[PDB]
Design an enzyme around this catalytic site. Structure first.
Site, short mmCIF file in Angstrom:
data_model
loop_
_atom_site.label_atom_id
_atom_site.label_comp_id
_atom_site.label_asym_id
_atom_site.label_seq_id
_atom_site.Cartn_x
_atom_site.Cartn_y
_atom_site.Cartn_z
N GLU A 60 0.80 -1.20 0.00
CA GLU A 60 0.00 0.00 0.00
C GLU A 60 0.85 1.27 0.00
O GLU A 60 1.92 1.34 0.61
CB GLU A 60 -1.00 -0.02 1.18
CG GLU A 60 -2.01 1.09 1.16
CD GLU A 60 -3.01 1.01 0.01
OE1 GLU A 60 -2.73 1.66 -1.03
OE2 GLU A 60 -4.07 0.32 0.14
N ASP A 88 -1.93 -5.06 1.04
CA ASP A 88 -1.34 -3.91 1.72
C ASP A 88 0.07 -4.21 2.14
O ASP A 88 0.93 -3.32 2.10
CB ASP A 88 -2.18 -3.59 2.93
CG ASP A 88 -3.51 -2.97 2.51
OD1 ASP A 88 -3.48 -2.19 1.55
OD2 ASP A 88 -4.55 -3.27 3.11
#
Ligand SMILES: Cc1cn([C@H]2C[C@H](O)[C@@H](COP(=O)(O)O)O2)c(=O)[nH]c1=O
Ligand SMILES: [Mg+2]
Length: 178
Positions: A60, A88
């Site tokens: 992310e 992420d």
């Protein structure tokens, strides 16, 4: 004493966080000046991603081309199934990708939304809420107690600082399903 969420964001989040969040919005034709509740939600999720990682590869926040390059590079260094979406984090220890959620709705609703989107048997999911509630795949919480406690504490700080500015009411009510 109803403040501006935009001014709150730039004043209470790290600038690197704000910029990454502005980039993620402009990437999808959303204006941080307009969709301000979304702009705060995106900063918060970014900050949680960075806190979770201090073992972990951050996905992310990265430019999408670099993020995928990084995801493919790990998947062929390792056995790991390639995610359909783009997680992420990657956990070098437990050797799995992780999706992080921060929600102002019920953690179960949000957890299962995420499970149903990613349709993966391998990707770990870990959801935090602004209430201190958390939920994580197979009740494996990955980090230790005080590390998750710090994340939950930062979430309280955000919420109280939003409350101070009259912003929490609208923020808390404006999350929709993705
Ligand atoms: C933190 C962050 C969030 N978001 C938005 C998308 C999701 O609604 C949520 C974070 O994405 P995710 O939880 O699917 O990884 O916030 C971004 O688009 N980019 C970001 O960098
Ligand atoms: Mg993500």
């Amino acid at each position: 004493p109803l403040g501006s969420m935009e001014d709150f964001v730039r004043q209470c989040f790290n600038p690197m966080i704000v910029e990454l969040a502005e980039k993620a919005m402009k990437e999808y034709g959303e204006d941080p000046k307009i969709e301000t509740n979304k702009f705060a939600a995106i900063c918060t999720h970014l900050e949680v991603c960075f806190m979770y990682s201090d073992r972990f590869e951050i996905i992310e926040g990265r430019d999408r081309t670099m993020a995928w390059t990084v995801v493919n590079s790990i998947c062929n260094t390792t056995g790991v199934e390639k995610p359909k979406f783009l997680p992420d984090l990657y956990d070098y220890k437990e050797n799995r990708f992780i999706e992080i959620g921060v929600t102002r709705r019920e953690v179960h609703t949000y957890y299962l939304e995420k499970a149903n989107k990613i349709k993966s048997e391998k990707t770990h999911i870990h959801i935090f809420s602004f209430t201190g509630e958390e939920m994580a795949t197979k009740a494996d919480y990955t980090l230790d107690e005080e590390s998750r406690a710090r994340i939950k504490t930062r979430l309280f700080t955000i919420r109280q600082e939003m409350a101070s500015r009259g912003l929490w009411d609208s923020f808390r009510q404006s999350e929709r399903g993705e």
